[PDB]
């Protein structure tokens, strides 16, 4: 599978100028979606923050002073929503916006492992700003009258993985953060696979998820990908589960009965 270098080629988006740099990168990002099926930006300084986060998650996975103390089935969950917490074995954690706000006891995993938790909250905030502006770019590619994506902070979650087939996300958008190793591969519009060069870089990839495929009525296919020789993290952005779905069919906004929560089930 051919390598796809992105360092120095994707638009640069600086940590303390995200909104303005994303505005300037808009046309480049549109052309990536049109020409690749996924999007990319280089974010100077993100790699350091993500590597530290990942490396501290790896340390926490071996501690006993223990992450399975915060397995999803013993962590307070929202009445309506997904499932944050730790998923033992290949082993990963879901750090939701709600969890970062302690919505109460749900933030205990971060109090128990506050070095990892401080990095994860930081990376969540950056990734959520990025992905919200990626969503604005995609929205601007959609017909006039397209509603705002309305990504929800509480329902969005950051996944961090410790030991790892073709698939796409179910949610609105995903933001792949630079992994520890190479192997993540994406399919182009012609059915050929490429391997973005992202390990140990500052490059983030933005994925179309199946919720946005549905909302855009098929205009944007999911950013299908797979992993093939180890740590990794990705933000999964969701709208509010209780909001009713919508769909832009042939230029017409149609409000459906089902909710976004129904889409997942
Ligand atoms: O394991 C990785 O490097 C990325 C896994 C993946 O597909 C994702 O986080 O969405
Ligand atoms: Cl995914
Ligand atoms: Fe994935």
Note the total helix count: 7
Residue share in helices?
25-40%
What is the percentage of strand-forming residues?
15-25%
Structural class: alpha+beta
CATH architecture annotation: Sandwich
- Strand arrangement within the widest β-sheet reads 2-9-6-11-5-4-3
What's the count of strands? 13
Number of domains: 1
**What sequence of helices (H) and strands (E) makes up the elements?**
EHEHEEHHHEEEEEHEEEEH
Q: Look up the CATH topology.
A: Jelly Rolls
Hetero groups in this structure are: 2-oxoglutaric acid, chloride ion, fe (iii) ion
Pathway: Antibiotic biosynthesis
Protein name: Isopenicillin N synthase-like Fe(2+) 2OG dioxygenase domain-containing protein
GO molecular function, one term: metal ion binding
Pfam family, one: 2OG-FeII_Oxy
Write up this protein.
The chain is an alpha+beta fold and 265 residues long. It has helices spanning 18-35, 46-61, 97-100, 108-112, 114-140, 210-215, 260-264, and strands at 3-5, 39-42, 85-87, 92-96, 157-161, 173-177, 184-187, 193-197, 203-208, 225-227, 232-237, 244-249, 252-259. The chain has a single domain (3-264), classed as Sandwich (Jelly Rolls), CATH 2.60.120. It is built from seven helices and 13 strands. A hairpin with a 2-residue loop joins strand 12 (244-249) and strand 13. Helix 2 packs across helix 5. The longest helix is centred in the middle third of the chain and has 27 residues, at 114-140. The protein is globular and about 55 Å long. Bound molecules: 2-oxoglutaric acid, chloride ion and fe (iii) ion.
């Amino acid at each position: 599978v051919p390598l796809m270098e992105l360092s120095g080629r994707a638009p640069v988006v600086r940590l303390h100028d995200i909104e303005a740099d994303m505005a300037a990168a808009t046309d480049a990002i549109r052309s990536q979606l049109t020409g690749w099926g996924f999007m990319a930006a280089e974010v100077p300084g993100i790699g350091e923050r993500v590597e530290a986060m990942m490396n501290e998650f790896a340390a926490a996975c071996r501690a006993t002073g223990s992450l399975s103390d915060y397995a999803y089935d013993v962590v307070p969950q929202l009445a309506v929503g997904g499932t944050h917490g730790f998923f033992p074995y290949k082993e990963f954690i879901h750090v939701s916006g709600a969890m970062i706000g302690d919505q109460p006891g749900a933030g205990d995993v971060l109090r128990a492992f506050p070095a990892f938790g401080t990095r994860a909250a930081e990376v969540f905030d950056i990734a959520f700003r990025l992905i919200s502006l990626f969503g604005e770019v995609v929205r601007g590619m959609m017909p006039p009258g397209t509603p705002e994506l309305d990504l929800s902070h509480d329902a969005t979650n950051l996944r961090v993985i410790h030991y790892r087939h073709e698939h796409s996300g179910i949610q609105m958008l995903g933001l792949q953060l630079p992994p520890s190793d190479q192997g993540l591969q994406y399919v182009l519009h012609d059915g050929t696979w490429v391997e973005p060069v992202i390990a140990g870089t500052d490059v983030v990839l933005c994925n179309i998820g199946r919720m946005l495929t549905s909302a855009s009525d098929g205009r944007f296919r999911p950013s299908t990908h797979r992993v093939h020789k180890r740590l990794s993290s990705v933000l999964f952005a969701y709208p509010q589960h209780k909001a009713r779905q919508w769909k832009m069919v042939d230029g017409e906004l149609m409000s459906l009965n089902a909710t976004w929560g129904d889409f997942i089930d």
